[PDB]
Amino acid sequence: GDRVADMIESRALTQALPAPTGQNTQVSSHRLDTGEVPALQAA
Amino acid sequence: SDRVAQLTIGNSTITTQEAANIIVGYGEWPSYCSDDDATAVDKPTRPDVSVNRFYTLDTKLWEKSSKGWYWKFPDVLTETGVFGQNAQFHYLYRSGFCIHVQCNASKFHQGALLVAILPEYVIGTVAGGTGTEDSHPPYIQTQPGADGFELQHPYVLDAGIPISQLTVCPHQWINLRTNNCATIIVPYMNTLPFDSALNHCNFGLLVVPISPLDFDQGATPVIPITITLAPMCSEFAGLRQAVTQ
Numbered sequence: 266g267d268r269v270a271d272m273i274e275s276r277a278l279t280q281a282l283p284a285p286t287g288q289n290t291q292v293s294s295h296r297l298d299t300g301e302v303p304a305l306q307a308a
Numbered sequence: 309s310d311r312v313a314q315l316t317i318g319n320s321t322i323t324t325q326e327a328a329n330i331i332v333g334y335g336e337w338p339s340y341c342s343d344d345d346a347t348a349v350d351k352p353t354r355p356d357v358s359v360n361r362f363y364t365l366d367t368k369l370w371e372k373s374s375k376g377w378y379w380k381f382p383d384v385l386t387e388t389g390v391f392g393q394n395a396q397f398h399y400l401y402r403s404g405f406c407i408h409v410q411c412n413a414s415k416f417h418q419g420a421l422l423v424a425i426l427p428e429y430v431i432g433t434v435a436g437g438t439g440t441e442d443s444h445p446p447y448i449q450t451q452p453g454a455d456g457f458e459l460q461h462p463y464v465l466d467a468g469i470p471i472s473q474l475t476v477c478p479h480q481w482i483n484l485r486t487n488n489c490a491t492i493i494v495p496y497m498n499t500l501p502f503d504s505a506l507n508h509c510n511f512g513l514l515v516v517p518i519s520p521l522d523f524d525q526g527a528t529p530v531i532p533i534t535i536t537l538a539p540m541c542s543e544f545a546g547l548r549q550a551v552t553q
């Protein structure tokens with residue numbers, strides 16, 4: 266019993282994945298690449 | 309997306325967040341010797357991790373009155389690590405290089421460098437001053453090793469060639485208002501596909517301040533220049549006992 270639109274319009278970010286063992290280490294090679302840097306983080 | 313980079317090869321990585329860009333010398337990456345080119349008939353060794361590392365070699369202090377330095381490659385690494393052990397056992401050798409020279413400064417310092425490569429950088433002398441006595445350069449001016457050597461007359465690069473057109477050869481600049489490092493990827497350039505690592509030095513890394521360092525007094529007066537290099541796609545052949553020279 267209202268005509269207002271204010272009242273009629275009036276949650277986790279993380280998913281628990283199953284992890285029985287520690288994760289594997291896939292094969293990497295060298296990389297000589299600008300633009301993207303995986304070391305420099307922002308603490 | 310160009311100022312920030314990371315170069316990981318071997319077990320050693322270097323991060324840079326004020327880079328210029330990576331230039332690849334003469335437009336091609338270092339690669340292994342194909343069977344169209346190889347003449348040696350023994351199977352080469354390829355260590356693939358233990359010698360493809362960024363070896364940090366030395367640290368030259370750059371003051372306001374410097375001339376310039378040069379390092380003969382690969383004789384900077386025939387005294388260091390598993391590269392220096394494989395190059396002394398094996399007669400033949402080929403590799404490329406990823407050459408990274410760091411020189412940081414504040415946002416009040418100024419000055420520019422020309423870190424450039426040039427292949428077959430042979431060294432002349434001053435010919436006895438007046439130019440009539442055939443003096444040959446000593447072994448330490450020829451091949452200084454990891455210690456480097458300082459240029460006497462950098463306008464002629466100690467070879468009678470002007471530095472004004474050194475910019476033909478693979479190079480990039482370190483001016484302290486824009487970047488702090490300079491990556492130069494160099495392939496293997498030589499006529500014959502392998503060569504000796506103790507006699508022949510394929511190229512020399514000229515690092516010359518063209519625009520001099522300047523800073524008002526009160527800032528940090530010690531501005532180092534450290535060069536790190538990584539032999540890429542290196543392979544050796546012809547195993548015998550250790551020679552050192």
Ligand SMILES: *[C@@H]1O[C@H](CO)[C@@H](O[C@@H]2O[C@H](CO)[C@@H](O[C@@H]3O[C@H](CO[C@H]4O[C@H](CO[C@H]5O[C@H](CO)[C@@H](O)[C@H](O)[C@@H]5O[C@H]5O[C@H](CO)[C@@H](O)[C@H](O)[C@@H]5O)[C@@H](O)[C@H](O[C@H]5O[C@H](CO)[C@@H](O)[C@H](O)[C@@H]5O[C@H]5O[C@H](CO)[C@@H](O)[C@H](O)[C@@H]5O)[C@@H]4O)[C@@H](O)[C@H](O[C@H]4O[C@H](CO)[C@@H](O)[C@H](O)[C@@H]4O[C@H]4O[C@H](CO)[C@@H](O)[C@H](O)[C@@H]4O[C@H]4O[C@H](CO)[C@@H](O)[C@H](O)[C@@H]4O)[C@@H]3O)[C@H](O)[C@H]2NC(C)=O)[C@H](O)[C@H]1NC(C)=O
Nearest residue numbers: 368369370371372373374375376458459460525528529530
């Ligand atoms: C016998 O007899 C004989 C005769 O005499 C003797 O001999 C002697 O010996 C002695 C001992 O050795 C001596 O003394 C010494 O000397 C030295 C040298 O001096 C010189 O040289 C210099 C150099 O310069 C350079 O650098 C600069 C900068 O720094 C620049 O600028 C320039 O340009 C140059 O550059 C170059 O080089 C470089 C190298 O590295 C390169 O790299 C580049 O490239 C280029 O090439 C010079 O400078 C000087 O000069 C002088 O002189 C002139 C004249 O002409 C003038 O003008 C100038 O100015 C000067 O003067 C000033 O200075 C000085 C000092 O130097 C003083 O002394 C005076 O007084 C004035 O002030 C010359 O030539 C020296 O080094 C030394 O000193 C030291 O010690 C003392 C005491 O011992 C003290 O006091 C001082 O301080 C000093 O200390 C320092 O150092 C150390 C070591 O190094 C250190 O460790 C310490 O830590 C210190 O540091 C500190 O402080 C500083 C300040 O200073 C600062 O900065 C820092 O940071 C820190 O903090 C000594 O003095 C002498 O010389 C001789 N003689 C003659 C004549 O010479 C004998 O001995 C007898 N016998 C017996 C037994 O006794």
